Design a protein around this ligand. Sequence first.
Ligand SMILES: CCS(O)(O)Nc1ccc2c(c1)-c1cn(C)c(=O)cc1OCCCCc1cc(F)cc(F)c1O2
Length: 109
Amino acid sequence: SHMEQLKCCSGILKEMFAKKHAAYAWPFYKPVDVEALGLHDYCDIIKHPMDMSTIKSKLEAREYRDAQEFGADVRLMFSNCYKYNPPDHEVVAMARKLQDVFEMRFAKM
Ligand SMILES: CCS(O)(O)Nc1ccc2c(c1)-c1cn(C)c(=O)cc1OCCCCc1cc(F)cc(F)c1O2
């Protein structure tokens, strides 16, 4: 059932927030602060922004029908990072390391 699927999704996000992955997961914790980072072109490039706190809030509010909808927002968060930032940038390599953790956990359910 989708009820048991969403419970596993809470567990995946819990690992993503844990101190174990904190070294590369921290730039995805809260929404991208465009004013603090000085990213003048971020809103023009990224139409649908996403972060781990928004996914955590949408999960508690039962905004996802199934595990696929949760995975769609998690992948949107990574896809936005790959689209905006340069390929050689630090945050892109951090996104790949966090996605390695997500893809492995998301597949094993
Ligand atoms: C917690 C959300 S925040 O409050 O906005 N903090 C926050 C801090 C640093 C960030 C990001 C966000 C960030 C994240 N993501 C996913 C993006 O697509 C774009 C970003 O900014 C790019 C410009 C800064 C360059 C940067 C340089 C480094 F050496 C490490 C990074 F992690 C960097 O990136």
